[PDB]
Amino acid sequence: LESQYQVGPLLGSGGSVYSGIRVSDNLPVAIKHVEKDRISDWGELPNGTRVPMEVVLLKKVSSGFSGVIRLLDWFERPDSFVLILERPEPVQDLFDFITERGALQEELARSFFWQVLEAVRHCHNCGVLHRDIKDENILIDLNRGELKLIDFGSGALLKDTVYTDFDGTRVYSPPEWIRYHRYHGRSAAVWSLGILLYDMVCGDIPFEHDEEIIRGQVFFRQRVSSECQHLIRWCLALRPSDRPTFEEIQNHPWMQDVLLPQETAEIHLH
Ligand SMILES: O=C(O)c1ccc2c(c1)nc(Nc1cccc(Cl)c1)c1ccncc12
Ligand SMILES: [Cl-]
Numbered sequence: 001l002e003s004q005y006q007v008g009p010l011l012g013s014g015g016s017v018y019s020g021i022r023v024s025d026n027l028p029v030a031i032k033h034v035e036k037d038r039i040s041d042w043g044e045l046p047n048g049t050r051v052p053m054e055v056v057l058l059k060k061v062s063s064g065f066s067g068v069i070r071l072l073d074w075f076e077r078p079d080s081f082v083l084i085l086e087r088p089e090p091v092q093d094l095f096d097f098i099t100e101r102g103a104l105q106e107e108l109a110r111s112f113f114w115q116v117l118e119a120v121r122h123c124h125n126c127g128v129l130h131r132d133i134k135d136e137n138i139l140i141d142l143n144r145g146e147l148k149l150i151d152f153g154s155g156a157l158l159k160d161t162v163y164t165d166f167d168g169t170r171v172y173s174p175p176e177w178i179r180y181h182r183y184h185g186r187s188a189a190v191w192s193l194g195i196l197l198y199d200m201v202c203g204d205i206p207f208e209h210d211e212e213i214i215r216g217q218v219f220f221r222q223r224v225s226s227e228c229q230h231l232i233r234w235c236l237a238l239r240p241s242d243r244p245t246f247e248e249i250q251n252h253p254w255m256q257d258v259l260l261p262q263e264t265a266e267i268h269l270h
Contacts, residue, residue: 005021163185
C-alpha cells in the first residue's frame with residue numbers, strides 16, 4: 001500500500017526524493033520516485049520481475065555494511081517506481097558540507113576519502129559499478145562520522161570488458177570517455193575518485209571543460225601536501241593503465257593512519 005510510510009517534504013530532484021518516516025518505528029527514510037519513461041536501463045530481479053537496474057544494484061550491495069545506502073523496500077506504480085531508502089539523521093551531503101566548510105583539512109579528507117574507497121570496493125566486490133562517484137552522491141552521518149554512497153541510478157553491473165555508454169557526471173568522467181567514448185569500470189572509477197579527492201582538499205573540482213580533462217594538467221589552487229598531490233596526480237593519469245589500483249591507493253603514504261569514523265565525528269563534526 002506504500003502507506004507503511006508518512007511522506008514529508010520534498011528534499012529535491014535530478015528522479016525526485018522526499019523525506020519520510022516508517023510508520024512502524026518512526027524510522028527515518030528517503031522516498032525516491034522514478035518515472036519509467038525516464039529510465040533507460042532495466043534489469044530482472046531473481047524472480048525475473050522487470051525493474052530499474054538501480055534496484056538490482058541496490059539489492060546486490062545491500063548488506064550490513066553501512067558505507068553504501070540500504071534499500072529498505074520498493075514499489076511499482078503504473079508510470080513510476082518508488083524506492084524506500086535509508087535516511088541518516090542528522091545528515092548532510094558532501095557537496096553541501098564542502099560548500100559551507102571550504103577546502104577540507106587533510107586529516108578529515110583522509111578519513112572521508114578512505115571511507116569512500118571502502119564503499120566503492122564493497123560495490124565492486126558485490127559486482128556493482130557506481131559510475132557517478134562525486135560529492136553530491138555521498139551522505140555524511142554527522143553523528144557517527146560515517147559516509148554513505150547513494151544514487152545508483154547511473155550504475156551498471158561490474159564487468160571486465162569495455163563500457164561504451166555513460167550516463168554519470170561529465171566533469172568526473174575520464175579522458176578516455178570524452179574522446180573515445182570507451183572506458184573500463186575500475187580505472188574510470190579511480191579517475192572520478194581523483195577528482196573527488198582534489199575537490200575535498202581544494203574545495204572545488206579541477207576541470208570544467210573537456211579540453212582540460214583531456215590535457216589532465218593539475219593545478220593546486222590551495223595548499224595541499226606533496227603526498228596528497230602525488231596521489232591525486234596518480235589517480236588522474238591520462239592513460240587508464242597508469243592509474244593506481246584500489247590497493248595502491250590505500251597503501252599510498254598519504255593514506256596511512258586513517259581516523260576511525262567516530263574519532264572523525266568527535267574531532268571534525270560534532
Ligand atoms: O538516490 C538515492 O539513492 C538516495 C538515497 C538516499 C538519499 C538521497 C538519494 N537523497 C537525499 N537527498 C536529496 C536532496 C536533494 C535532492 C535529491 Cl534528488 C536528494 C537524502 C537525504 C537524506 N537521507 C537519504 C537521502
Ligand atoms: Cl594531516
